[PDB]
Structure formats: structure tokens, C-alpha cells
Amino acid sequence: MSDTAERVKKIVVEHLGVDADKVTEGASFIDDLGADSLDTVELVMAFEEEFGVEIPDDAAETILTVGDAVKFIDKASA
């Protein structure tokens, strides 16, 4: 039913190569996936280039769980 969620999650599943079910709003790419700030940054950049938006650097710091990254891309998408 979601437009941005499905997109973000999809890209994450095709990029990370993990399960989609695991990609939930409360899914932290840091712990849930056991990744570091690096992974988060990379993902953010990918989505930014995919949708074609412009966000600050601090944004990557605010993006912890899927819901964060998704909500961000959707917010900047407008």
C-alpha cells in the first residue's frame, strides 16, 4: 500500500540481498543487520541518487531504522 516504503525496502533487498520481511519500520540496519555507520551512509546516498533528492549530512545520523530512511526519502521526494 506504501509507495516509498515498497521502494526503499525493495532497493534494500536488491542491494543488501536480504529478506524483505526483515525490512520492517523497526528494523535498524545497524543492529538488526549488524552494520556500521558506513552501510547507513552508502544506503542513504543510493536512495538520494535514485529518487534524485538533496539532504544534509546530519540526515544519515537521524536515519537509524527503515522507517527513518524511508520517511526521509519520502519527505525530500516532495
Looking up cell 547507513 gives 40
Q: How was this structure determined?
A: NMR
The active-site residue out of 31, 36, 58, 68 is 36
Listed in sequence order, the residues at least 6 apart from 16 whose beta carbon sits closer than 8 Å to its beta carbon are: 33
Tell me how far CA of residue 22 lies from CA of 1, 33, 77, in angstroms.
Answer: 17, 9, 24
The answer to whether 12 and 66 have CB atoms below 8 angstroms apart is yes
The answer to whether 8 and 16 have CB atoms below 8 angstroms apart is no
**Is 36 assigned a catalytic role?**
yes
The β-bridge partners of 78 are none
